[PDB]
Structures are given as C-alpha cells and as structure tokens.
Amino acid sequence: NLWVTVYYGVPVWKDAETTLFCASDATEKHNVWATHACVPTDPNPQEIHLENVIEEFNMWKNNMVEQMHEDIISLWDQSLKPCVKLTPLCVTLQCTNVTNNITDDMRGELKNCSFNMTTELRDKKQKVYSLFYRLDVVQIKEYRLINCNTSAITQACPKVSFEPIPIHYCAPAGFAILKCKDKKFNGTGPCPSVSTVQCTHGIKPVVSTQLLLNGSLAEEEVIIRSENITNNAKNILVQLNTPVQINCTRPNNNTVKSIRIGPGQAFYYTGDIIGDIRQAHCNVSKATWNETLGKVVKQLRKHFGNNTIIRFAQSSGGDLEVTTHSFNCGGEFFYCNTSGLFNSTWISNSNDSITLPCRIKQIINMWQRIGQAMYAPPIQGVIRCVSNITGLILTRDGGSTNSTTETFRPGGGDMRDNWRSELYKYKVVKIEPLGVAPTRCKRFLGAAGSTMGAASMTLTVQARNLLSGIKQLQARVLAVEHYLRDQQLLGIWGCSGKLICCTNVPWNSSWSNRDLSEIWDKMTWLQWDKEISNYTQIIYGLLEESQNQQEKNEQDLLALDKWASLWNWFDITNWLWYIK
Amino acid sequence: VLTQSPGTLSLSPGETAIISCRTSQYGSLAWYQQRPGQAPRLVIYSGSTRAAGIPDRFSGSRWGPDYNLTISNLESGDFGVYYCQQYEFFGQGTKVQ
Amino acid sequence: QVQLVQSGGQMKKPGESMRISCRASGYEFIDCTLNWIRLAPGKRPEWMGWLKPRGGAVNYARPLQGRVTMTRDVYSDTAFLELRSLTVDDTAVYFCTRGKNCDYNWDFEHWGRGTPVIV
Amino acid sequence: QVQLVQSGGQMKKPGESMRISCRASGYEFIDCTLNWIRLAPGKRPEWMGWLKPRGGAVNYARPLQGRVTMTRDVYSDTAFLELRSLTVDDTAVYFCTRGKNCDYNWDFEHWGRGTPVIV
Numbered sequence: 001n002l003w004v005t006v007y008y009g010v011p012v013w014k015d016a017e018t019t020l021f022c023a024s025d026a027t028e029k030h031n032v033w034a035t036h037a038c039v040p041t042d043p044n045p046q047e048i049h050l051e052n053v054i055e056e057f058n059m060w061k062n063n064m065v066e067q068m069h070e071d072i073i074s075l076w077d078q079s080l081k082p083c084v085k086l087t088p089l090c091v092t093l094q095c096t097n098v099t100n101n102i103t104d105d106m107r108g109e110l111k112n113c114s115f116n117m118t119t120e121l122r123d124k125k126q127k128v129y130s131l132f133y134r135l136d137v138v139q140i141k142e143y144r145l146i147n148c149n150t151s152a153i154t155q156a157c158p159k160v161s162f163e164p165i166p167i168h169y170c171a172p173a174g175f176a177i178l179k180c181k182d183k184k185f186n187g188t189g190p191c192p193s194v195s196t197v198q199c200t201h202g203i204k205p206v207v208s209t210q211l212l213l214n215g216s217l218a219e220e221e222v223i224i225r226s227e228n229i230t231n232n233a234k235n236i237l238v239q240l241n242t243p244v245q246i247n248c249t250r251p252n253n254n255t256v257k258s259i260r261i262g263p264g265q266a267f268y269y270t271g272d273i274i275g276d277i278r279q280a281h282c283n284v285s286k287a288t289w290n291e292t293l294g295k296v297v298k299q300l301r302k303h304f305g306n307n308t309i310i311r312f313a314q315s316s317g318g319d320l321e322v323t324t325h326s327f328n329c330g331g332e333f334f335y336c337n338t339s340g341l342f343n344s345t346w347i348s349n350s351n352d353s354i355t356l357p358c359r360i361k362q363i364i365n366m367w368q369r370i371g372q373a374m375y376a377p378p379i380q381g382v383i384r385c386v387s388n389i390t391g392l393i394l395t396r397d398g399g400s401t402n403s404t405t406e407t408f409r410p411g412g413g414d415m416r417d418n419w420r421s422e423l424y425k426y427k428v429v430k431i432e433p434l435g436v437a438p439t440r441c442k443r444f445l446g447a448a449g450s451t452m453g454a455a456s457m458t459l460t461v462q463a464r465n466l467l468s469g470i471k472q473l474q475a476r477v478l479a480v481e482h483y484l485r486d487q488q489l490l491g492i493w494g495c496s497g498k499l500i501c502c503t504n505v506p507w508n509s510s511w512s513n514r515d516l517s518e519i520w521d522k523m524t525w526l527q528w529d530k531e532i533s534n535y536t537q538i539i540y541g542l543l544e545e546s547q548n549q550q551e552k553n554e555q556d557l558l559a560l561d562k563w564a565s566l567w568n569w570f571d572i573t574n575w576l577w578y579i580k
Numbered sequence: 581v582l583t584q585s586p587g588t589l590s591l592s593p594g595e596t597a598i599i600s601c602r603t604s605q606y607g608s609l610a611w612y613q614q615r616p617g618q619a620p621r622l623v624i625y626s627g628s629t630r631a632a633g634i635p636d637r638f639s640g641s642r643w644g645p646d647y648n649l650t651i652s653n654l655e656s657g658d659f660g661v662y663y664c665q666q667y668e669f670f671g672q673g674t675k676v677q
Numbered sequence: 678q679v680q681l682v683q684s685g686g687q688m689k690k691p692g693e694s695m696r697i698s699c700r701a702s703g704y705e706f707i708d709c710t711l712n713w714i715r716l717a718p719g720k721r722p723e724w725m726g727w728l729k730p731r732g733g734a735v736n737y738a739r740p741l742q743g744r745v746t747m748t749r750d751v752y753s754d755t756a757f758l759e760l761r762s763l764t765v766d767d768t769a770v771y772f773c774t775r776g777k778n779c780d781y782n783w784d785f786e787h788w789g790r791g792t793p794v795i796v
Numbered sequence: 797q798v799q800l801v802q803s804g805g806q807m808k809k810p811g812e813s814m815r816i817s818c819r820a821s822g823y824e825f826i827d828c829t830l831n832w833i834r835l836a837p838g839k840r841p842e843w844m845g846w847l848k849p850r851g852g853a854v855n856y857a858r859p860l861q862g863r864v865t866m867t868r869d870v871y872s873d874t875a876f877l878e879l880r881s882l883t884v885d886d887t888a889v890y891f892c893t894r895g896k897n898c899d900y901n902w903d904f905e906h907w908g909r910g911t912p913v914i915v
C-alpha cells in the first residue's frame with residue numbers, strides 16, 4: 001500500500017532560457033569593455049561534477065549566444081555614446097596622392113585630403129591636412145568620406161581602448177549553468193559527463209571574421225562542429241588543437257595630431273608619416289599552418305568520403321569584413337588578405353612565413369548594422385600583436401553533382417559563430433524543485449545522477465539556492481514570483497512545511513505505476529520526472545482536492561467541539577431496546 | 581544525386597496522382613508545384629508537412645530512402661510540373677497531364 | 678506579406694553580361710538568406726547560389742563559379758545577380774527565393790515573379 | 797598603475813622665479829590630493845604644501861607663505877609649483893607626491909622622478 005508523497009527541491013532540469021548576468025574580475029582597465037555593472041568573480045568555487053548523467057547539449061540553439069550578442073552590442077554602443085560626433089567632418093575634401101617626392105607608387109593608398117573644417121568659435125574655420133586611407137574616402141579631385149551619405153560617424157573616445165577583457169556569464173538564482181566537460185564533443189548530442197558551474201570560464205569578447213583569435217583550444221585533436229555538414233548554408237566551425245601564432249603589424253610611425261572641432265570636442269587624425277610608407281603585414285609560420293591544415297583535412301575527411309579530395313580556396317565574395325580576416329590590433333583595425341593561407345589542395349593520402357597583406361580602415365562599421373559607423377582614431381607609433389589562431393570558420397561550396405572534390409572557403413559576416421565557439425559547452429537549465437513520488441508513509445545540485453532517497457538527504461541545499469538593468473529586475477522579480485508560486489502550491493496541498501511531506505492520496509495504477517520497487521532503489525529523480533511529466537497536473541489537482549478540501553472539512557469545526565457521550569444515536573437506538 | 585518518376589503522368593480529372601522520388605542522401609525532401617506561366621510554389625516540405633494554404637488533398641509518406649507524393653481528386657488548378665528538392669538539389673520534374 | 682519583386686524581360690546575345698535586381702519587402706531584409714534558382718523548360722532546375730545580405734556573404738554553385746556574382750544594397754533592400762559569358766544553354770526563368778524561415782532556408786515558400794531570359 | 801612625471805634640471809640664480817610641472821596619470825586626477833616635498837642633503841625633508849585639484853584649494857607651509865604658489869590644469873592633468881624669490885638655501889630636489897589612498901593624505905606611496913634645482 002503506497003500513496004503519494006510530496007518532495008520539495010528534488011534536482012530536475014527544464015531547458016528554459018533566461019537572462020544571465022555579468023561576473024568580471026576586478027582604472028585604466030575600466031575604460032575598455034567594462035561598464036562596471038559587473039560583480040567581481042569568485043575563484044570558481046562551485047564546480048559540482050554530476051556523476052552518471054546524460055544531458056542533451058545543442059550548441060546551435062542556445063539563448064546564451066543571442067544574449068551575449070545583444071550584451072556585447074550594448075556594451076559597444078554604451079562605450080561609443082559619450083564620444084564626439086563627426087557630423088561636422090562630412091565635408092568636401094580635395095585629396096591628392098601621398099607625397100613620394102617622385103612618381104613612386106603610394107603604399108596603403110594614403111591620400112592627403114585637405115578640408116576646411118570648423119573650430120570652437122562658430123565664425124572661424126581652419127584648413128586641415130589629414131592623411132586618410134583610400135578605403136575610407138569615396139570620390140564625388142573632390143573626395144568625401146565613405147559613410148556621409150548613409151550614416152553618422154561617432155568617433156571612439158581617444159583614451160578608450162578595445163582590448164578584450166574576459167567576461168564570465170553567471171545564471172540567476174533558480175537557474176544553473178551546466179557545462180559539458182567531454183573531450184571530442186562535436187557540439188550537438190548527448191554529453192556523457194556534466195558539471196554544474198555558477199559562472200562560465202571567462203569568455204573573451206574578441207571580434208575576428210575568418211580566423212578566430214585567442215579562443216579556447218581543444219585538448220586531444222581538431223574538432224569540426226557543424227549542424228548538418230551536408231548543408232551548405234551552415235558554417236563549419238573548427239577548433240584547433242595547437243595554436244598557430246600570427247604576428248601582425250602596421251610598419252608606419254604615424255605622426256598623429258589633434259584639432260578642436262567645437263566646444264569640448266576634439267578630432268584626432270594622421271598628421272604625417274615620418275618613415276617609409278610600408279604595407280601592413282601579418283606573418284604565419286608556413287610549416288605550422290601546413291600541419292594545421294593537414295589535421296583539419298583529416299577531421300573533414302572523416303565526415304565526407306574517405307577518398308574525397310579536400311581543397312581549400314580564397315573567399316569567393318562579400319564585404320571587406322567577410323572577404324578578409326578582420327581584427328583590431330592595439331586599437332587599429334586590420335583587414336588582412338587570407339588568400340595566401342587558403343589556396344592549397346589536398347589529395348587523398350620550414351622557417352618561412354606566409355606574409356598576408358593587410359589594409360587598415362579608420363571608419364569601421366562592425367556588427368553590420370544599417371545606419372551606424374565608427375571612426376577609430378589613429379594610434380601613434382608602430383603597433384604589433386602576437387595573436388593565436390585558435391579556431392577557423394569555413395563554408396563548403398555546394399551545388400556540385402557527383403565529383404569527389406569539396407571546396408572549402410573562409411566564411412563569416414555573422415559574429416554569433418565566434419561566441420558559439422566558446423559557449424558550445426554551456427547550457428542553462430531551470431530548476432523545477434517540486435516533485436511527487438510513491439511512499440508507504442500514508443499520513444549545489446550534486447548527486448543528480450544518484451538514485452532517489454540519496455537526493456532527499458541533501459534536499460535542503462537546492463531549496464537554499466532558490467530566491468538567491470530592466471532585464472535584471474525582471475529576472476529577480478520572476479525568481480521571486482516562481483518561489484511564491486511554488487510555496488503557494490505547497491501550501492494548497494497541505495504541505496506548508498518544506499522538505500518531506502506525506503499526504504493521503506492513493507497512488508493510482510493509472511499514474512505510471514512502474515511496479516513501485518525499482519522506482520526508489522535503482523533510479524534517479526530526473527528519469528522519474530521524465531516518466532510522470534504528463535500526469536503531474538492530475539496529481540496536483542487530486543492532491544489539492546484530497547488533502548486540502550476534504551482535510552479541511554474533516555478537520556473543520558469537526559473535533560473543535562467534542563462532547564459526545566451519546567454518540568452515534570442511530571446506533572444507540574440499535575441497542576437501546578434490542579438489549580431488552 | 582536524386583531522381584523522380586514517372587517523367588510524365590497522363591491522368592484525367594478526378595483521379596489520384598502518385599509520384600515517386602528516389603534520394604541518395606539523408607535530408608528532408610520538399611515538393612514544389614509549377615503552374616505553367618507562374619512562379620513555382622511549395623506544396624509540401626519535410627516529406628509530409630503542408631505549406632500554408634495547401635488543401636488536405638496533397639499529402640505524402642513513405643519508408644526508407646524513398647518518398648511519395650499522393651494527390652487525390654485532381655482539380656483544375658493541378659496539372660503543373662512537380663519538383664523534388666533536397667539540400668539545394670532538384671529532380672528532373674514530373675509533368676502531370 | 679513577404680514579397681519579392683523582380684525586374685525582367687531581358688534578351689541577350691552570347692558573350693554579353695546580364696544583371697537582375699530583386700527587391701525584397703515585408704520582412705527584415707538583413708537577417709534572412711536569399712537564393713537564386715534557374716528554371717529552364719525541359720531541363721532539371723539548377724540552384725545558382727545563396728547570399729547572406731548581413732555581411733554580403735555569397736556561395737556560388739560549383740558549375741557556375743567564375744561566372745556568377747551576387748551583391749546587394751541594404752539601404753534599398755535589393756539583391757543583384759550578375760551573370761557573365763552567357764550561352765545558348767542559359768535561357769531560363771531566374772527566381773529569387775527565400776526559405777520558410779531563416780533557420781532552414783531550403784523550404785522556399787516565397788518566390789519572385791520570375792525573370793525570363795532568352796539567349 | 798599611477799604615474800607622476802616631472803620636468804627638471806632648472807638652473808637659476810638668486811632672486812629669480814621657477815615653475816615645476818607635475819603631470820599625473822593613471823588615477824583620476826580630480827579625485828586625490830597632491831603634495832609637494834623638498835629634499836636635500838644635510839637638512840630635513842620639508843613639506844611645501846598640498847593641492848586639492850578639484851576646487852583648486854591649496855595649503856602652503858608657514859616658512860614658504862608669500863613665496864610659493866600652486867596651480868592646477870585639470871584638462872592637462874598637470875599640477876604646477878611656482879616659487880618666487882628663489883635663493884641659495886632653496887637648492888634642493890623637489891618631489892610631487894600622492895598618498896597611498898585618497899582618504900589618508902600622508903602615506904606618500906606615489907612619488908615622481910624628482911626635480912633637481914641648483915641655485
């Protein structure tokens with residue numbers, strides 16, 4: 001004879017999305033990428049491994065990536081908003097080729113580009129000579145700026161840097177982030193080993209289009225991530241085992257000067273170039289890249305036919321962001337031509353650097369929004385970077401009929417792929433603490449894979465985590481509302497007290513009987529919740545009716561006034577005179 | 581990579597049309613209709629799911645790496661050319677007459 | 678409400694280049710792909726390529742690489758298909774298409790009027 | 797990081813005036829008091845004064861009152877120490893100093909390079 005019992009806090013998961021808040025480890029640093037709305041990080045104090053749990057991870061549909069895209073866009077816009085506008089600078093420029101002193105070819109396509117401009121006093125004007133890159137300037141020799149006819153240009157504030165700073169994403173109270181620690185996790189499937197972690201592993205916001213930079217590296221081998229790799233539209237993300245070191249630089253002294261375009265507004269421009277005019281370049285070691293492409297070819301050959309000829313090639317077309325590797329170095333935006341590193345062909349089976357040309361634009365329209373642009377101020381002196389090419393993004397040229405050759409090209413344009421490469425492991429799971437089980441009474445997040453009864457001994461800890469700008473307030477208010485809903489349901493069932501509560505409702509055979517022997521011995525709470533999920537509303541309603549309405553009526557004023565010596569008069573009759 | 585049969589299907593009004601499609605790849609198969617002189621329009625996707633505005637008359641179901649399009653009680657708005665589609669790959673098309 | 682409007686009626690002789698514009702409306706132009714389809718009488722349909730207008734990323738069908746270009750204007754929501762080195766086998770109706778949704782783009786519910794091209 | 801940078805090496809005669817700049821960087825210049833210290837062999841360290849470069853408030857030491865002025869340029873983040881009627885006994889090395897934190901002023905943690913002045 002087993003009847004229903006109600007447990008509060010049993011560990012179970014619902015995959016609902018939610019707003020995840022900041023966690024950034026702690027004056028110069030405050031200028032860049034930090035809104036100081038972000039709490040200091042605890043030193044990874046709670047990483048509770050969960051033993052013998054199989055959770056379905058799908059990197060491709062997780063709300064954390066979209067939330068991070070919105071958050072990084074908002075961070076960028078907030079940084080740009082209190083900075084000088086360059087609407088005064090949309091003027092007619094008389095541009096001339098940079099002075100080589102003879103007819104020598106101009107390198108980088110720098111253009112002298114004088115203009116009239118304004119000053120602090122409204123009446124006066126000040127002729128200004130400023131070298132502008134040709135990609136920034138468009139003809140109308142009369143010349144104008146590229147984005148004048150479409151979008152207003154907001155200068156980045158001069159002191160502000162853009163260097164990536166790690167951001168840890170931590171779920172609110174009532175939701176717990178689950179990390180998949182499995183090596184060789186291709187991103188979409190069951191994860192053999194799961195852990196509960198409060199905060200993600202300090203994801204770095206780094207913006208790079210073709211080749212991911214400074215990301216996290218795989219442990220064992222290259223991993224090829226793609227949903228339906230047969231599909232052409234879906235990008236193939238590649239996580240590399242070994243970093244490939246890219247050494248990038250602009251070799252120009254770049255003498256910078258400033259003018260005041262208005263009251264409290266300043267404009268920073270390239271006054272002059274002291275040294276020789278030289279192209280920007282990025283070096284990648286040829287042997288390292290050859291080995292990396294060999295490893296990537298092996299992992300790609302696994303998915304397609306083993307006989308297939310895998311050929312790489314330059315990007316077919318698009319905007320300069322898509323067509324070329326984009327990235328910032330020391331505050332200067334580089335667009336580097338990757339055709340040198342992707343034109344090999346691999347047929348079925350040293351100390352020289354592949355030098356990639358690079359062109360630098362000052363006017364950046366990143367995130368590909370309509371109607372917005374930013375002027376990156378020039379940076380004085382020679383700039384260098386030593387990035388690690390930790391990941392690649394590829395797309396397969398499709399439409400071929402038969403033939404063993406597969407053409408892979410660099411791809412991009414959508415920056416969600418960059419953050420998918422780092423947030424692949426993480427999932428957000430809601431905690432639905434309430435649960436109902438059979439038992440013969442008849443009156444954080446650890447041990448999830450542990451069988452029932454083991455959970456109850458630690459039950460309290462889950463009940464402790466619950467209950468702990470506009471979206472954060474909404475998150476907290478919804479956490480409070482969820483807690484009040486759970487407590488109200490617990491009270492309506494008669495279980496005002498938390499923890500174990502026993503209730504007289506007979507365990508119907510219809511409610512997924514299951515034999516009522518292994519249920520409690522050999523089985524964990526999650527598989528139970530999978531079983532009884534459909535019947536839960538009926539159980540809740542029957543609990544409310546049986547041990548709340550009937551219990552109220554049989555413990556209403558009944559027994560409140562108990563004086564009955566002549567009780568059961570319709571039986572006192574039955575042996576009143578019958579004895580006689 | 582994929583094909584469909586029969587090439588031409590000569591039926592009268594009120595009869596049921598059956599068109600088979602053989603695929604050599606895993607991937608959801610959609611069926612399109614082309615009225616002569618108009619742009620083609622999707623009639624079903626995912627093998628058996630109908631597009632918006634398509635009547636119950638159109639349906640399809642099959643097992644293995646084959647697909648079937650069944651069209652009961654042919655009407656005047658039928659008698660187009662019917663195309664298989666997999667991941668950016670089409671069949672030669674069946675003309676219903 | 679999703680609408681794709683094509684300019685057409687062009688006639689070209691072998692060796693000439695050709696351009697088709699496709700104006701898209703009724704939905705956010707940026708976030709959803711476009712595909713180009715070539716339907717000829719008596720031939721199998723040929724898929725020509727896809728274009729992601731957010732970054733303008735383009736994927737051409739392998740038989741037509743080196744001949745086809747696709748570009749786009751986002752301030753006037755237009756997609757331009759340029760085809761070079763026309764031959765007699767390029768006579769067909771050219772369609773600009775978009776999937777049912779922007780996650781699985783191959784379910785082309787939405788098609789343009791169709792641009793006949795005769796060579 | 798906190799840095800104070802001075803310009804020095806001034807060579808003056810008796811009776812002339814002198815000006816020493818002190819550029820502050822790293823910390824918010826307008827949220828922390830500066831002090832000016834004088835060091836020399838033989839004689840004790842001497843405090844010249846403190847400067848609060850928000851309101852520009854200044855406090856001078858009694859031996860130097862009427863001879864020493866302090867100014868602040870909040871847009872260049874530059875304090876200035878001007879000394880009049882410079883004489884032989886003012887030959888010394890001058891420091892621009894800041895406390896360890898902006899709550900207690902006399903824990904001079906951040907010192908500049910130093911400004912020699914030879915009369």
Ligand SMILES: *[C@@H]1O[C@H](CO)[C@@H](O[C@@H]2O[C@H](CO)[C@@H](O[C@@H]3O[C@H](CO[C@H]4O[C@H](CO[C@H]5O[C@H](CO)[C@@H](O)[C@H](O)[C@@H]5O)[C@@H](O)[C@H](O)[C@@H]4O[C@H]4O[C@H](CO)[C@@H](O)[C@H](O)[C@@H]4O)[C@@H](O)[C@H](O[C@H]4O[C@H](CO)[C@@H](O)[C@H](O)[C@@H]4O)[C@@H]3O)[C@H](O)[C@H]2NC(C)=O)[C@H](O)[C@H]1NC(C)=O
Nearest residue numbers: 228229230606607608609627641642643644645646647648
């Ligand atoms: C890209 O994304 C697509 C989806 O868009 C993914 O395609 C799907 O892939 C999965 C596998 O990942 C496919 O499931 C497998 O399909 C096999 C066949 O399933 C179809 O046929 C069976 C009947 O087959 C019997 O008869 C065959 C012919 O005699 C015989 O070969 C076979 O052995 C069987 O005897 C149907 O029951 C089933 O519903 C399915 O139907 C297909 O065709 C109909 C046509 O109307 C269509 O509606 C369906 O959508 C589908 O196209 C089969 O080999 C395999 O079975 C394996 O698993 C089962 C587990 O139960 C196990 O019992 C068995 O022993 C095998 O181990 C499995 O079911 C799925 O069908 C694909 N769906 C589509 C729409 O294409 C694709 O995987 C993905 N690519 C990548 C790389 O991720």
Ligand SMILES: *[C@@H]1O[C@H](CO)[C@@H](O[C@@H]2O[C@H](CO)[C@@H](O[C@@H]3O[C@H](CO[C@H]4O[C@H](CO)[C@@H](O)[C@H](O)[C@@H]4O)[C@@H](O)[C@H](O[C@H]4O[C@H](CO)[C@@H](O)[C@H](O)[C@@H]4O)[C@@H]3O)[C@H](O)[C@H]2NC(C)=O)[C@H](O)[C@H]1NC(C)=O
Nearest residue numbers: 028161163164206213214327328329330331385386387388
């Ligand atoms: C992937 O990750 C790599 C490795 O970290 C990054 O490479 C770093 O790049 C940044 C700039 O992008 C470098 O930091 C800058 O270095 C310059 C040199 O520093 C001088 O001063 C410091 C003082 O501590 C000395 O240690 C050093 O020897 C030099 O004398 C400076 O130009 C920068 O500081 C100046 O500008 C910044 C504005 O950002 C101000 O905050 C400073 O006050 C100052 O004015 C800055 O320090 C860094 O050194 C590089 N790391 C290396 C070589 O290991 C890649 O950028 C990253 N890739 C991508 C694509 O993001």
Ligand SMILES: *[C@@H]1O[C@H](CO)[C@@H](O[C@@H]2O[C@H](CO)[C@@H](O[C@@H]3O[C@H](CO[C@H]4O[C@H](CO)[C@@H](O)[C@H](O)[C@@H]4O)[C@@H](O)[C@H](O)[C@@H]3O)[C@H](O)[C@H]2NC(C)=O)[C@H](O)[C@H]1NC(C)=O
Nearest residue numbers: 312313314337338339340341342343344345354355356357
């Ligand atoms: C794609 O990979 C291909 C296979 O490696 C590369 O193709 C090779 O590219 C070279 C360089 O152009 C072709 O020409 C060779 O070049 C030199 C002579 O070049 C001289 O002139 C150039 C002027 O630009 C100058 O820069 C050089 O320093 C030299 O002074 C000779 O060694 C050869 O005879 C030859 O002509 C090769 O022909 C070509 N090989 C093949 C098999 O096609 C291609 O460069 C790669 N693309 C990218 C973008 O990296």
Ligand SMILES: *[C@@H]1O[C@H](CO)[C@@H](O[C@@H]2O[C@H](CO)[C@@H](O)[C@H](O)[C@H]2NC(C)=O)[C@H](O)[C@H]1NC(C)=O
Nearest residue numbers: 138139140146147148149150151750751752753
């Ligand atoms: C702003 O100006 C640019 C540059 O003129 C316009 O873009 C096109 O630029 C190409 C470059 O080859 C020219 O061939 C085209 O003629 C330009 N288009 C037009 C309509 O002239 C861009 O379209 C302009 N922006 C707006 C909103 O009109």
Ligand SMILES: *[C@@H]1O[C@H](CO)[C@@H](O[C@@H]2O[C@H](CO)[C@@H](O)[C@H](O)[C@H]2NC(C)=O)[C@H](O)[C@H]1NC(C)=O
Nearest residue numbers: 096098099100112113114129130131271272273
């Ligand atoms: C851009 O052109 C201006 C005007 O020709 C150059 O400015 C001149 O530079 C020379 C050499 O330094 C000076 O002697 C002249 O006095 C400057 N002229 C004016 C009107 O200021 C400028 O150098 C050019 N830009 C370069 C070389 O980058």
Ligand SMILES: *[C@@H]1O[C@H](CO)[C@@H](O[C@@H]2O[C@H](CO)[C@@H](O)[C@H](O)[C@H]2NC(C)=O)[C@H](O)[C@H]1NC(C)=O
Nearest residue numbers: 314315319320323324336337338339340343357
């Ligand atoms: C990136 O650099 C490569 C270097 O080869 C460029 O490739 C050339 O592209 C033009 C464009 O038509 C061709 O005419 C040349 O024949 C190509 N050269 C080779 C060796 O294939 C490529 O155009 C550059 N990309 C960009 C966006 O500037």
Ligand SMILES: *[C@@H]1O[C@H](CO)[C@@H](O)[C@H](O)[C@H]1NC(C)=O
Nearest residue numbers: 095096097098105106109141
């Ligand atoms: C500048 O150089 C270009 C080649 O890049 C040349 O065509 C043009 O005529 C030059 N213009 C001037 C004004 O010298």
Ligand SMILES: *[C@@H]1O[C@H](CO)[C@@H](O)[C@H](O)[C@H]1NC(C)=O
Nearest residue numbers: 092093094114115116125127
């Ligand atoms: C600047 O303004 C003056 C006003 O007289 C005008 O004559 C001149 O052409 C302008 N200069 C340039 C370089 O546009």
Ligand SMILES: *[C@@H]1O[C@H](CO)[C@@H](O)[C@H](O)[C@H]1NC(C)=O
Nearest residue numbers: 186188189190226227228229
């Ligand atoms: C690899 O990804 C495929 C889809 O491409 C998925 O079906 C499969 O489960 C994954 N394999 C794992 C996690 O071992």
Ligand SMILES: *[C@@H]1O[C@H](CO)[C@@H](O)[C@H](O)[C@H]1NC(C)=O
Nearest residue numbers: 252253254255274275381382
């Ligand atoms: C740029 O020129 C200045 C001129 O004073 C020089 O001091 C400096 O070293 C130069 N920069 C480089 C990177 O050589």
Ligand SMILES: *[C@@H]1O[C@H](CO)[C@@H](O)[C@H](O)[C@H]1NC(C)=O
Nearest residue numbers: 245246247283284285353386
């Ligand atoms: C990049 O520069 C580092 C020093 O910063 C050097 O050790 C390394 O070999 C260089 N790598 C390449 C590929 O040039």
Ligand SMILES: *[C@@H]1O[C@H](CO)[C@@H](O)[C@H](O)[C@H]1NC(C)=O
Nearest residue numbers: 290291292293294344345346
């Ligand atoms: C180096 O590159 C060549 C040409 O692409 C290739 O054949 C060879 O296998 C590569 N060697 C490696 C990966 O050791």
Ligand SMILES: *[C@@H]1O[C@H](CO)[C@@H](O)[C@H](O)[C@H]1NC(C)=O
Nearest residue numbers: 214215242243244245387388
């Ligand atoms: C680049 O790679 C080296 C070698 O693995 C590694 O030690 C270093 O930390 C990497 N750099 C960054 C910025 O992660």
